[PDB]
Amino acid sequence: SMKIDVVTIFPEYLQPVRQSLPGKAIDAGLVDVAVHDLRRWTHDVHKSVDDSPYGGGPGMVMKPTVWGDALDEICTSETLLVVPTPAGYPFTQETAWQWSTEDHLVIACGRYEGIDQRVADDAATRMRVREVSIGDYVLNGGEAAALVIIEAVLRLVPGVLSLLEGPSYTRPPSWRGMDVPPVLLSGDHAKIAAWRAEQSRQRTIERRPDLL
Amino acid sequence: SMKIDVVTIFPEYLQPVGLVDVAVHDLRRWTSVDDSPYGGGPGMVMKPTVWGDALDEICTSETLLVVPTPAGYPFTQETAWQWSTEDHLVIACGRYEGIDQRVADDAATRMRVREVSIGDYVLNGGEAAALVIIEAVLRLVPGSLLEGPSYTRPPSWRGMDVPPVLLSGDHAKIAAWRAEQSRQRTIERRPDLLGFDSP
Numbered sequence A: 001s002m003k004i005d006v007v008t009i010f011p012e013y014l015q016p017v018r019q020s021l022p023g024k025a026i027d028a029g030l031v032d033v034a035v036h037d038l039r040r041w042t043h044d045v046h047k048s049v050d051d052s053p054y055g056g057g058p059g060m061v062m063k064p065t066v067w068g069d070a071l072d073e074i075c076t077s078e079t080l081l082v083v084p085t086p087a088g089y090p091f092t093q094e095t096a097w098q099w100s101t102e103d104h105l106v107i108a109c110g111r112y113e114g115i116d117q118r119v120a121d122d123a124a125t126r127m128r129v130r131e132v133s134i135g136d137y138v139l140n141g142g143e144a145a146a147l148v149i150i151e152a153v154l155r156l157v158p159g160v161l162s163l164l165e166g167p168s169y170t171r172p173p174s175w176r177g178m179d180v181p182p183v184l185l186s187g188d189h190a191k192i193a194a195w196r197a198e199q200s201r202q203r204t205i206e207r208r209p210d211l212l
Numbered sequence B: 001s002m003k004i005d006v007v008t009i010f011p012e013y014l015q016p017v018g019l020v021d022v023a024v025h026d027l028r029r030w031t032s033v034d035d036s037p038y039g040g041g042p043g044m045v046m047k048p049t050v051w052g053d054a055l056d057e058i059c060t061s062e063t064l065l066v067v068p069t070p071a072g073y074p075f076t077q078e079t080a081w082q083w084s085t086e087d088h089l090v091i092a093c094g095r096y097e098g099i100d101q102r103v104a105d106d107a108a109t110r111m112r113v114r115e116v117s118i119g120d121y122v123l124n125g126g127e128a129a130a131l132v133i134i135e136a137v138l139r140l141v142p143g144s145l146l147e148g149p150s151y152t153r154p155p156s157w158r159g160m161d162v163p164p165v166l167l168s169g170d171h172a173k174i175a176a177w178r179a180e181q182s183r184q185r186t187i188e189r190r191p192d193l194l195g196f197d198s199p
Ligand SMILES: Nc1cc(-c2ccc3ccn(Cc4ccccc4)c3c2)n[nH]1
Pocket: A084, A085, A086, A087, A109, A110, A111, A112, A113, A114, A115, A132, A133, A134, A135, A136, A137, A138, A139, A140, A141, A142, A143, A145, B147
């Protein structure tokens, strides 16, 4: 049973998430994903969510007063507050496993140059906060990261949704001049397992030497 | 100018997307897309036949074929820069337990192919990875260390003050403080970026 609240100035970005959820899991109360427009918590007629960076520099910074009100409303002391950021700790499968048993995730999606640091710092005085990066590339905001996190976590929640894996094959046995490796059709399952293990080792050496 | 084609059995997932055109194609237009794995194992594999026909129609020899997969080479910022000057990206999104390896092998006889991972976690398919790749690449289209903390008004909030140096207007002191913050953050969160052991 997990509640996920996502806060964003682009609520439509998260439409695929609510789409990918099977009715049975929602009906069984296993998962609830809610998306909130950050501008609900703006103070002014111009619905401002950003402002110039102290110390100067390019880009804009999201306002702490707006974010503070939104998180005040949405979070509780039991919330795990997830803040995507290119400067975050790495989000890995181990993280996804850990978060998969949480009762309440709140994902705060930044835009522009990010969120005033006091927002996370204030939140961390009364709840668990996790600033996380999903990889070593730069996005325009947290929304695509939220999609990735939500998918990786929820597929580990029952019934809701190391070396590298080697190549996989299915029918037909021959296609465009390329045969499925004969060992796979051999019925020697010890040999198949060893062949797969060796494929995995080779692929890891070639693609991800860092894992070795 | 860049053209991106995305191929998927879930075209609706790609909807979160003049110098660039992006098109989404339903793989099923070229047909059941999956079958049991040769050699055994859980799950299903996407059949090469349907993929071959789709890519035949969509790709040229100039195409960079991008295939998200947990077993891929890492997609990094360097990759994003490299791909930002390409004329034509085609992103083949798999589902189930992935795509028959022969699809990428066949394609590689005609075009450049890149199997890539966007990070060390497992998705249910290639669609979310396509969204990530598209965003990271397109923000670089013509037309290190971790980022430190940023602040904006008010200078005091809930009794939390903006670091006084940022209000001082001294560029050199500000540049120095931000460098220190970034180095401190990199050591703590990403020690690997500075050549140290991971936690
Ligand atoms: N792994 C990962 C995470 C992000 C991410 C997350 C949230 C935000 C909010 C704004 N931006 C844009 C930005 C560009 C440069 C410097 C700071 C912020 C974000 C990027 N990118 N890559």
